[PDB]
C-alpha cells in the first residue's frame, strides 16, 4: 500500500495500556500465583504469552475472571514478566534469572526464554 | 533500573492485538458510524484516542457495548483510523485526507491531526 507509519505508535499504545494497568482500569482477569494476585487485561496477556493465548481462546476459559497458575510458579518471576509484557523492559538479575526463565518457559514467551538462556551461558 | 529491553516487543504486541481484531477475538464494543458497525477492543481504542479514553473511563459509559458516533463522522475516515490504531499505518490519500483529519480531530488523535495538517499545507 501507500500508507505512512508513525514510528512511536506501538510504544505509545503499550505505555497507555500500562497506565490503564497501574490505575486498574478495564482489567478483566486476576492471575493467581500461590498467595499473590495480579490484575491484568486478557488481550495484553494473550498478545505476550502462548499460554494465555491458548487459555483465553478456549470457549470455556475465555469467560473466567480468575486463572490459577501451576503452584511451582514463582510470584516474583511472574511479576517481572507481567511488567515486561506491559513495558518491553525485563528486570533480569543473577538472583532472579532461574525463576524468570522457568516462568517464561511455562508462559511460552520465546524471546524472554532466549535472552535468559544466553545470559546463563555467558556466566558458566 | 538495570532492565534490558526487547526492541520489537511493542510492535509484536500490536500485531497480535490486530490478529485478535481480525478474528473478532475478545472484542468488547461495537462503534456505530451511521449505517456501519466496527468491532474493537475498548483498551486499544482508549490507548489511541482521547475521545475513547474519556468515554470508557466514564462510570456509566464504561459498561456500554455499543457507542454511537456523531452523525457527521464519515465511516471510511473512521475505518482508516481504526486500522491505524491497530497497525501504526495510516492510509492517507488526496481523496480521504479531509474526512480522516475531521475524524482524527473528533477522536482526539493528535499525531494524525498533525500529519494531516502538514500534508494539506504542502498541497496549497
Amino acid at each position: 500500500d501507500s500508507c505512512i507509519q508513525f514510528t512511536r505508535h506501538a510504544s505509545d499504545v503499550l505505555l497507555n495500556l500500562n497506565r490503564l494497568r497501574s490505575r486498574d482500569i478495564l482489567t478483566d482477569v486476576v492471575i493467581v500465583v500461590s498467595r499473590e494476585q495480579f490484575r491484568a487485561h486478557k488481550t495484553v496477556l494473550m498478545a505476550c504469552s502462548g499460554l494465555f493465548y491458548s487459555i483465553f481462546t478456549d470457549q470455556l476459559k475465555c469467560n473466567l475472571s480468575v486463572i490459577n497458575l501451576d503452584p511451582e510458579i514463582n510470584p516474583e518471576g511472574f511479576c517481572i514478566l507481567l511488567d515486561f509484557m506491559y513495558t518491553s523492559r525485563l528486570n533480569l538479575r543473577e538472583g532472579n534469572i532461574m525463576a524468570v526463565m522457568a516462568t517464561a518457559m511455562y508462559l511460552q514467551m520465546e524471546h524472554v526464554v532466549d535472552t535468559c538462556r544466553k545470559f546463563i551461558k555467558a556466566s558458566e | 533500573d538495570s532492565c534490558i529491553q526487547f526492541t520489537r516487543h511493542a510492535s509484536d504486541v500490536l500485531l497480535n492485538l490486530n490478529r485478535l481484531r481480525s478474528r473478532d477475538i475478545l472484542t468488547d464494543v461495537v462503534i456505530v458510524v451511521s449505517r456501519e458497525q466496527f468491532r474493537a477492543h475498548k483498551t486499544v481504542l482508549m490507548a489511541c484516542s482521547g475521545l475513547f479514553y474519556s468515554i470508557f473511563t466514564d462510570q456509566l459509559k464504561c459498561n456500554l457495548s455499543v457507542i454511537n458516533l456523531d452523525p457527521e463522522i464519515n465511516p471510511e475516515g473512521f475505518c482508516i483510523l481504526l486500522d491505524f490504531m491497530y497497525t501504526s499505518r495510516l492510509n492517507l490519500r488526496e481523496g480521504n485526507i479531509m474526512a480522516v483529519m475531521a475524524t482524527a480531530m473528533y477522536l482526539q488523535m493528535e499525531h494524525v491531526v498533525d500529519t494531516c495538517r502538514k500534508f494539506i499545507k504542502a498541497s496549497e
Binding site: 500508507c3 505512512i4 507509519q5 508513525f6 514510528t7 | 495510516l90
Partner: peptide, 4 residues
C-alpha cells in the same frame, strides 16, 4: 512519520 516515515515511509514503511
Amino acid at each position: 512519520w516515515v515511509i514503511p
